[PDB]
RNA sequence: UACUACCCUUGACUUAUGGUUACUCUAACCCGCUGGCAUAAUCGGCCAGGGAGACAGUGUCUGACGGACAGUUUGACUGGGGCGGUCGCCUCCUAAAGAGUAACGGAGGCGCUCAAAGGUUGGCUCAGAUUGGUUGGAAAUCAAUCGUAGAGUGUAAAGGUAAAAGCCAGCUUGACUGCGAGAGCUACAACUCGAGCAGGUAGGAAACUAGGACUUAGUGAUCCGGUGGUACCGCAUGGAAG
RNA sequence: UAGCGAAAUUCCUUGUCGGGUAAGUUCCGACCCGCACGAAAGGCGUAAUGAUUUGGGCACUGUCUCAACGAGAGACUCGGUGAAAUUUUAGUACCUGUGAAGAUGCAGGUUACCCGCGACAGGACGGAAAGACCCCAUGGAGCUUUACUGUAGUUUGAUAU
RNA sequence: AACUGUUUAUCAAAAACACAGCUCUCUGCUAAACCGCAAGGUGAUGUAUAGGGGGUGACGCCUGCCCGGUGCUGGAAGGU
RNA sequence: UCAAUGGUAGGAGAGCGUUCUUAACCGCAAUGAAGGUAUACCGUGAGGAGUGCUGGAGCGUUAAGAAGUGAGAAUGCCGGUAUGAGUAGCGCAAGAUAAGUGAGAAUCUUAUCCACCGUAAGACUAAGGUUUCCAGGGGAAGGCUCGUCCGCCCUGGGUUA
RNA sequence: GUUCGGCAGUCAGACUGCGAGUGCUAAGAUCCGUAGUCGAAAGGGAAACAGCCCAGACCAACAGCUAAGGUCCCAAAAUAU
RNA sequence: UAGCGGAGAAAUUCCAAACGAACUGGGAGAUAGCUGGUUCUCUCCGAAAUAGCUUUAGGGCUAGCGUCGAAAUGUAAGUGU
RNA sequence: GUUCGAGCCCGUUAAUGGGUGAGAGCGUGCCUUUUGUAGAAUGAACCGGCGAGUUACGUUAUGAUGCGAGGUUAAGUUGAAGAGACGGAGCCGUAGGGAAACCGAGUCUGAAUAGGGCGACUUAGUAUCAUGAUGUAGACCCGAAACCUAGUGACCUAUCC
RNA sequence: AGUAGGGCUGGACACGCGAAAUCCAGUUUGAAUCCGGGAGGACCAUCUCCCAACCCUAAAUACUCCUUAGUGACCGAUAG
RNA sequence: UAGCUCAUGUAAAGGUAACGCAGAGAACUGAAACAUCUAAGUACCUGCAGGAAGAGAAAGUAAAAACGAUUUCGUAAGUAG
């Protein structure tokens, strides 16, 4: 044998919009079981510890704190 | 046929028993009263006549 | 002669006029320990049938 | 506590009696028993005895074993097939810089705990190195110095991790109810969240936070039978049954 | 346990030794390390008996050194008589390659007057045999069992008789 | 392997079967056993030296151990 | 004018041809219907008619409807014909000559020799066969060849308790 | 392009590179992603060639030009510079 | 002495040119995720050979992949650069 | 095999005629399956005939027609197996929400009159026909080994008398 | 009148023992009887209906070997 | 009395096209296998009958005023179950 038919079911990790889009209030931003990016205004961290929006508007990235971030700038 | 798997409907819960004393009234619009004027004593005789 | 309606399938389903069918929820009968608190908060109700699936309606659930 | 006692616990015996075991009888039944009748005729029937006997056998249920004989069952992969192993779910590589993922490819696992390791408030920073000090050890302890985490994070691994998710105290039972816009993921079933609102709450002075745990294993479809509630139906009618 | 042991049993391995044998894995006799002998699933013996199985020898010998001869029947020449299997049709060569990965028929190249007739077998993956080997089918049969369900049958008890 | 016999005609005659023999076990009679729903009948006008089943296969020697388990038998205290 | 037109399983559209259609429409037909045959026409196709000939009764039109409805191919089937092939075989034993017979004799008949069997390859008798026996006549097939011969064929008799 | 409605079949492919994995970094070997090709696409080239390269065919045609590839003869173009 | 059977010096042996289950008729045109077969003409468009599940792996069920029709053309989405 | 064609022969659905054809170029039969068959993968001797996607009833889709919130007669009766006419019993649509009580253009869910859910907003069907697909009918056919019932069979052979 | 019923075992009724009606079997037990008795899908009351446990009943329906009168968008000698 | 004898009565045995009724009664299938179901109480087999048979006069249905033996067809409608 191998003891290696033991399997992992991969799943979708990464981005959803990532670029200034008019993403819906309470909509998904970036799947994270582990935070590379870090939150901001109009943005919630999930029970799935992702980033989810709260209010529509542009969702550009910011280098706050010497670190990677997402808020939502309105309009 | 789910390929030998149980089907969509075969996974359904058993929901709601049924009244044997279920009875309704063959409901019409008031738009037929717009048809007939006045038809004094609007009844089943006015309905099926 | 006629095409026999499956009466127990009719006991599975309930469809609407000018619209789809109401499908009650899975998982909701047998154990409730490992299903979550939120799944208890939300899985009493249930959503509709599919769109690209369920076309095996025809015509096993006829005219009920 | 003598009259009449409406009387009560153990015994005893008349009676009602009943399963009640054993024995006896014989009218039942039986006797591939006797002998006779027609039948000339060993089958049968009848007569007349003997033997047995309320059994036997027969019916209907019930228990026993039961291949004597049937009816079906005995997976899937696979480097032919077979053996072995594996068949679920989570984690990393293989994944090709979105995802997507191939093989009986690698590596691990999990098939849990925790009324507090959960919430909240309020504080704290580790491991390790070196010095020096009675028991002394490589570390027990201590103090000092250095010390971005070279620790820890309940539980493997991954990511994350100091405004701490790390560590310790108090409150603490939000690991609330009813939801849920909006989303994501995608055969479906599922699954991942979730703004915000209401009903009140719980901390916290207030603000603020709170729908489990640092996130991710810790879990399975419908039936069927329970458990409780139930303004529901309750088969003419009420109830009840269900 | 007795008793037999390279067994119709040891692939363990041409076990060992000795005999038969010049030449001797087989044969016999002992040894016996018995994978895995073996006692009523009889074990060890056992004359006569065997269409037995082997091993040796004698005898006789065309089996063979290494063949040859003649007799008859077909064959074959003709007269009469006259079928079967068989198949896309084909005036159907060779080499070397190529290609569902082995050429008659294809590419290149070679030799070949045309048609026969008697014998022969290398092909034509020759026929005849929808492989009886293997595999698969939610295929079926048959068989077995302390599979599961049963059945009769067997044996309790009730109870009318 | 005792023998003679028998053995797959459309393959195989044998060491296979059988066989006397030997062993055990079951059956007291309207047998046991068996066939048939039963009836009826076999067993056999049989009576334990007979009938049925199991083993082994003359003769010679011999058949050792172990009742833990299974089955069988028998017993009933209790459980069921 | 521009653009398009490889195309399998796939899907859409359209058309041809056969037969029956009471329909009608409307004819042909013995001076020749149908059908066959040759044909050196036309039509994108399927398909269509012209002529020559066979042939001597039904057929065609149009349009529409309705369909057992469009034929290679399956161990397709049935029926016929190849093929091999004038080859195998000619079904376990020896006849021979002369003469007849006829039309035609190897094979029919006679004569005369030979030959074979002879615990049979004799005779007689079960079952069986069901008239095969014999006489006369004939030779469509049968006789495994021929054939005047015959268990073949026609006719007639033939079995007595 | 979406939506809605019918109607499908396809489940098992190869091969060529290119990047992986397994394998003796053996293979016309497997198993991925990626493009093409065939399949289901003739003609030409490479001696025939399903997969490589070029080039996508309605048809006629006694037209020319050209792709790769060729130009001593078969077998056409250069005994070309 | 007749097939759920028989016979059997027993091999799975035979039961009428012949048997691990006889032969004849009916059920019943049993069934068959497996083999083969499919017939007139044209035009247009034009595949897949994959994911997920599956007593499933040579088969199905969706989804991806065609075709036609209809409703508008998320007011362009599509597809390039 | 084409295509060209020396040469020959003949003269036609009168036609840029036909029958040839030396020679020369280039040319792997047809079917199912497959990833790929030219095949040494099948299968086909040939020729002719037959020989396979229907209908019964039902649903869905698409059109055609008719009328339209009104469409619709079934069975049956009449009658020529006519037609027409009768026959409205019933059936479809004409609001749903919720399991249901029930409510109703709203309804359910929920303390909600919060949200969500389905709802008129969200705008016509009915009936017949026709076509495709459907489903019960062997249901596109050809196909086993099979299963059971009923019956026949001991002259082969085995047993027995 | 062993009649209804009741027990058990069945079966049919759409009814696969089920809440199971209701009917009919085996087996067992066994009524009331006109103030009666039965049904109304377990069952208890009120109401509705009926009178079993006795027997006969045309008609409308099923199918043709048959007798003709016949009819065919049946079929033409592999057909029928 | 059994039993025996005689006489009388086709009675009645039997042949049967199909339909019926009643008893006895499977399997194959299908359920993707299959033990429940189905197939169907159908295949078969036996008996009893006629021109038809059964069939039948509420110890019925139903649920409100509701009728008044049956039978066949349509419906309800695959509706209730």
Curated annotation (Swiss-Prot), chain A:
Family, as annotated: Belongs to the bacterial ribosomal protein bL27 family.
GO MF, any single term: structural constituent of ribosome
Source organism of the structure: Lactococcus lactis subsp. cremoris (strain MG1363)
Region called Disordered, residue ranges: 1-17
Keyword list, A-Z: Ribonucleoprotein, Ribosomal protein
Protein name per the record: Large ribosomal subunit protein bL27
Superkingdom field: Bacteria
Gene Ontology process terms (BP): translation
Post-translational modification: The N-terminus is cleaved by ribosomal processing cysteine protease Prp.
Keyword Ribosomal protein on entry: yes
GO CC terms of this entry: cytosolic large ribosomal subunit
Lineage per the UniProt record: Bacteria, Bacillati, Bacillota, Bacilli, Lactobacillales
Residues included from the entire protein: 17 to 91 of 94
From Swiss-Prot, chain B:
Chain's role: Binds to the 23S rRNA.
Self-association and partners: Part of the 50S ribosomal subunit.
Organism the protein comes from: Lactococcus lactis subsp. cremoris (strain MG1363)
Name of the protein described by the UniProt record: Large ribosomal subunit protein uL15
Any coiled-coil regions, as ranges: none
Assigned protein family: Belongs to the universal ribosomal protein uL15 family.
Gene field: rplO
Swiss-Prot record, chain C:
Family annotation (InterPro entries): Ribosomal_bL35 (IPR001706), Ribosomal_bL35-like (IPR021137), Ribosomal_bL35_CS (IPR018265), Ribosomal_bL35_sf (IPR037229)
Composition bias, Basic residues: 1-15
Entry similarity comment: Belongs to the bacterial ribosomal protein bL35 family.
Region (Disordered): 1-20
Signal peptide: none
One GO cellular component term: cytosolic large ribosomal subunit
The entry's keywords: Ribonucleoprotein, Ribosomal protein
A single BP term in Gene Ontology: translation
Protein name per Swiss-Prot or TrEMBL: Large ribosomal subunit protein bL35
Residues annotated as transmembrane: none
Record flagged with keyword Nucleotide-binding: no
Gene Ontology MF term list: structural constituent of ribosome
Domain of life: Bacteria
Species of provenance: Lactococcus lactis subsp. cremoris (strain MG1363)
């Amino acid at each position: 044998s191998t003891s290696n038919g033991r399997d992992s079911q991969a799943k979708r990790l990464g981005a959803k919009a990532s670029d200034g889009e008019l993403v819906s209030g309470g909509s998904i931003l970036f799947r994270q079981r582990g935070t590379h990016i870090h939150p901001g205004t109009n943005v919630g961290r999930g029970g799935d510890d992702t980033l989810f929006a709260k209010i529509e508007g542009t969702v550009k990235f910011e280098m706050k704190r010497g670190k990677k971030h997402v808020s939502v700038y309105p309009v | 046929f789910e390929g030998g798997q149980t089907e969509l409907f075969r996974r359904m819960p058993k929901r709601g028993f049924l009244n044997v004393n279920r009875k309704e009234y063959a409901i019409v619009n008031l738009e037929t009263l717009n048809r007939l004027e006045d038809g004094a004593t609007v009844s089943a005789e006015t309905l099926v006549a | 002669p006629k095409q026999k309606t499956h009466r127990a399938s009719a006991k599975r389903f309930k469809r609407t006029g000018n619209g789809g069918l109401k499908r009650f929820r899975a998982y909701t009968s047998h154990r409730f320990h490992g299903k979550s608190v939120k799944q208890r908060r939300q899985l009493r109700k249930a959503s509709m049938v599919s769109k690209g699936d369920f076309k095996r309606i025809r015509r096993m659930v006829a005219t009920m």
